[PDB]
């Protein structure tokens, strides 16, 4: 029996290394990672890898790892796949903990835009969780935290994190993580997976996939939102991604909106993440 070494980047930036039989399906690796993380509520999570385009792909747990990574290194990242719309309803604190770690990276990366005050408030709950009660001895008027809070850091943001941290005295890590999530879950891009596309007129848009449905972001004045109940069907042909939208009451025919993706793989990727989120919505 021949085993391949897997390297997984965990959400605190640490690296986990294990071996699986070379014909292993994704689930085998994932089960090992989740056991290492003491994670039971595993269905919200997944493993990603990067292809030679350095684009992110979900490792399909049902398929052989080798037929997915193909020519690439057996190098993966552990990630939230399905963002819970109501994290307070997860059964375990450790589940909320990993969700917070993912959202910290969503914020620092700019995937999850955040006002100055929300950056500072989220940062303040992270500090309370990671370090406990505010301690002036560590701080000082010139303090910069080790923690990454934002896509760009400013002294004003560091100061506001400390001001709000003072107000959390006595808060336990589980409580500070619940507060982090109660705030983050309300942000307009929470759990939104964005895909570059062109509309049928060739205008650059973003397609957003999330729990509630499909977002078409043309510009600030031109946004469309299709809750899952309004989406009949989706398809990809070559580089094309098509959405069928139910008729409004007393209309006879669905409408088709068409999108051009950069290539066939990007269309297939968008299709699969939409199917997977749709199946999530069905079970909520
Ligand atoms: C697997 N499908 C189900 C689906 C229905 C409605 C919305 C969806 F995002 C997915 S499909 N590819 O449309 O035939």
Count helical runs. Answer: 7
Shape by Cα distribution: globular
Structural class by sheet pairing and helices? alpha+beta
List ligands, each type once: N-[(3-fluorophenyl)methyl]-N-methylsulfuric diamide
Largest β-sheet summary: 5 strands, mixed
Rg result: 21 Å
Helix content: 25-40%
Strand order within the widest beta sheet: 2-1-5-3-4
Approximate strand percentage: 25-35%
Gap between N and C termini, in Å? Answer: 41 Å
Order of helices and strands: EEHEEHEHHHHEEEEEEEH
> Could you give the count of β-strands?
12
Tally of structural domains: 3
Domain FERM: 4-284
Protein name: Band 4.1-like protein 3
GO biological process, one term: myelin maintenance
Subcellular location: Cytoplasm, Cytoskeleton; Cell junction; Cell membrane; Cytoplasm
Tags for this entry?
monomer; 284 residues; alpha+beta; 3 domains; globular; cell adhesion; SGC - Diamond I04-1 fragment screening; PanDDA
Topology (SSEs and partners):
Elements: E1 3-9, E2 15-21, H1 26-37, E3 45-50, E4 56-58, H2 66-69, E5 75-80, H3 93-109, H4 116-131, H5 155-166, H6 173-184, E6 193-198, E7 204-209, E8 213-219, E9 222-227, E10 231-237, E11 240-245, E12 255-260, H7 264-283
Bound molecules: N-[(3-fluorophenyl)methyl]-N-methylsulfuric diamide.
N-[(3-fluorophenyl)methyl]-N-methylsulfuric diamide is lined by residues 231, 233-234, 274-275, 278.
């Amino acid at each position: 029996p021949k085993s391949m070494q897997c390297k997984v980047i965990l959400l605190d930036g640490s690296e986990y290394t294990c071996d699986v039989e070379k014909r292993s399906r994704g689930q085998v690796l994932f089960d090992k990672v989740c056991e290492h993380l003491n994670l039971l509520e595993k269905d919200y999570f997944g493993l990603t890898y990067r292809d030679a385009e350095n684009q992110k792909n979900w490792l399909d747990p049902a398929k052989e790892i080798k037929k997915q990574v193909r020519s690439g290194a057996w190098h993966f990242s552990f990630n939230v796949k399905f963002y819970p719309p109501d994290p307070a309803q997860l059964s375990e604190d450790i589940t909320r903990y990993y969700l917070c770690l993912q959202l910290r990276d969503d914020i620092v990366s700019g995937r999850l835009p955040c006002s100055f005050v929300t950056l500072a408030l989220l940062g303040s709950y992270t500090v309370q969780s990671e370090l406990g009660d505010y301690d002036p001895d560590e701080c000082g008027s010139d303090y910069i935290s080790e923690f990454r809070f934002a896509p760009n850091h400013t002294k004003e943001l560091e100061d506001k994190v400390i001001e709000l941290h003072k107000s959390h005295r006595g808060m336990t890590p589980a409580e500070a993580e619940m507060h982090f999530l109660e705030n983050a879950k309300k942000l307009s891009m929470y759990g939104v997976d964005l895909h570059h596309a062109k509309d049928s007129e060739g205008v650059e848009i973003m397609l957003g996939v999330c729990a509630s449905g499909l977002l078409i972001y043309r510009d600030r004045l031109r946004i469309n939102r299709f809750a899952w109940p309004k989406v009949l069907k989706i398809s990809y042909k070559r580089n094309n991604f098509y959405i069928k939208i139910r008729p409004g009451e007393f209309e006879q025919f669905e409408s088709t909106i068409g999108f051009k993706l950069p290539n066939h793989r990007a269309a297939k990727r968008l299709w699969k993440v939409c199917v997977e989120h749709h199946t999530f919505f069905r079970l909520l």
